[PDB]
Amino acid sequence: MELWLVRHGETLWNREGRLLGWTDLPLTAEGEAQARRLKGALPSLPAFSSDLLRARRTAELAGFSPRMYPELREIHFGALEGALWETLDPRYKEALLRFQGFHPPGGESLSAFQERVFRFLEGLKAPAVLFTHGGVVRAVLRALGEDGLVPPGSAVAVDWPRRVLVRLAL
C-alpha cells in the first residue's frame, strides 16, 4: 500500500534539541512555512493526522482536511518530555539512538508505541497521506531496513509493508 508519511514542520524544541512527544507545542513560523510548501506537492489522497496541534496544523497548511487519530501520535516521553538531549542520561540517549530498549519514565515503551503505529497502518484500505511525527516515520523506515531520519516538514512515500518509494524534501 502506497503511504505518504509526513513529518510535521519545525517546533521550537525541534530546534533546541529537546524531546518532544505528547507536549502539544505549536509550529514555529518556519514550521508553518515548511507545511505550506507541501501544498500541491503531495498527492491529494485522503488524509489522516495525529491529534497533536503541530500535526493538525501541518495538514491544514498543506491543503488537507485530515481525520484525527491518536494512534499517529509521537511516542509519549513521560517525565522526559522537554528533556534537554545534552543532559539526558546516556542510558536513555543510547536506547533512543539504537531505537531499542527504551521506555521513558511515565511515557510509552518503544514496543507499545510501534505496535499502535503499525496496527494503524494495517487498518488502511487505500493509499493515503499521514501527517505524523519523526518517531513514527523512523519506526516505519527502520522496519523497512532503511534509516528513518528525515527533516521536519518533509515526506517519504512507502510501499508498505515492502519498501520505500520516494523521499520528498524541499
Quick recap:
The PDB classes it as hydrolase. This protein has a single domain (1-170), classed as 3-Layer(aba) Sandwich (Rossmann fold), CATH 3.40.50. Helices cover 32% and strands 16% of the residues.
Give an overview in words.
Substrate binds at residues 7-14, 54. InterPro entries: His_Pase_superF_clade-1, His_PPase_superfam, PG/BPGM_mutase_AS, PGM_Phosphatase. Pfam families: His_Phos_1. This is Alpha-ribazole-5'-phosphate phosphatase. It comes from Thermus thermophilus (strain ATCC 27634 / DSM 579 / HB8). The chain is α/β, with parallel strands linked by helices and 170 residues long. It has a single domain (1-170), classed as Phosphoglycerate mutase-like (Rossmann fold, 3-Layer(aba) Sandwich). The protein is 32% helix and 16% strand. The chain is built from six helices and six strands. The protein has helices spanning 12-16, 29-37, 53-61, 90-98, 110-122, 134-143, and strands spanning 2-7, 47-49, 67-68, 128-132, 155-159, 163-168. Strands 3-2-4-1-5-6 form a six-stranded mixed β-sheet. α3 (53-61) links the parallel β2 and β3. The protein is globular. The two termini are 24 Å apart.
